């Protein structure tokens, strides 16, 4: 909003409050909230499972 | 570009060449190319099946 620089090449989410005053370019990447989970580790088999 | 119309909400890509002559907005959804294929059915074979 002041003037010490006119570029900021860093992940800076494009949002309404950040768009009211700042001016943004086209998005060069896409984001999104997604879950994370311990994958199925394995069968964990006991040979005496019979 | 003739100004005979105004805001035109419809499918319209944000490609480079189109942006050269007209202005755009921030996209209201994002999409790409994806594989379309038939659901598996399961008319399973002979010998192998048993
Ligand atoms: C399952 O049934 C449909 C309708 O007969 C058929 O088109 C398809 O080939 C069968 N199997 C597969 C590969 O989905």
Swiss-Prot record, chains A, B:
Gene: Grik2
Protein name (record): Glutamate receptor ionotropic, kainate 2
Post-translational modification: Sumoylation mediates kainate receptor-mediated endocytosis and regulates synaptic transmission. Sumoylation is enhanced by PIAS3 and desumoylated by SENP1. Ubiquitinated. Ubiquitination regulates the GRIK2 levels at the synapse by leading kainate receptor degradation through proteasome.
Function in brief: Ionotropic glutamate receptor that functions as a cation-permeable ligand-gated ion channel, gated by L-glutamate and the glutamatergic agonist kainic acid. L-glutamate acts as an excitatory neurotransmitter at many synapses in the central nervous system. Binding of the excitatory neurotransmitter L-glutamate induces a conformation change, leading to the opening of the cation channel, and thereby converts the chemical signal to an electrical impulse. The receptor then desensitizes rapidly and enters a transient inactive state, characterized by the presence of bound agonist.
Residues reported in the UniProt entry to bind L-glutamate: 11, 13, 18
Localization per Swiss-Prot or TrEMBL: Cell membrane; Postsynaptic cell membrane
Residues bearing glycans: 41
Expression across tissues: Highest expression is found in the olfactory lobe, piriform cortex, dentate gyrus, hippocampus, granular cell layer of the cerebellum, and in caudate-putamen.
Additional observations: The postsynaptic actions of Glu are mediated by a variety of receptors that are named according to their selective agonists. This receptor binds domoate > kainate > quisqualate > glutamate. It does not bind AMPA without coexpression with GRIK5.
Source taxon at top rank: Eukaryota
SUBUNIT field: Homotetramer and heterotetramer with GRIK5. Tetramers may be formed by the dimerization of dimers. Assembles into a kainate-gated homomeric channel that does not bind AMPA. Can form functional heteromeric receptors with GRIK4 and GRIK5. Can form functional heteromeric receptors with GRIK3. Interacts with DLG4. Interacts with NETO2. Interacts (via C-terminus) with KLHL17 (via kelch repeats); the interaction targets GRIK2 for degradation via ubiquitin-proteasome pathway.
């Amino acid at each position: 909003i002041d003037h010490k620089a006119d570029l900021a090449v860093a992940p800076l989410a494009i949002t309404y409050v950040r768009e009211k005053v700042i001016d943004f370019s086209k998005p060069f990447m896409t984001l999104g909230i997604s879950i994370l989970y311990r994958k199925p580790n394995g069968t964990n088999p006991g040979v005496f499972s019979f």
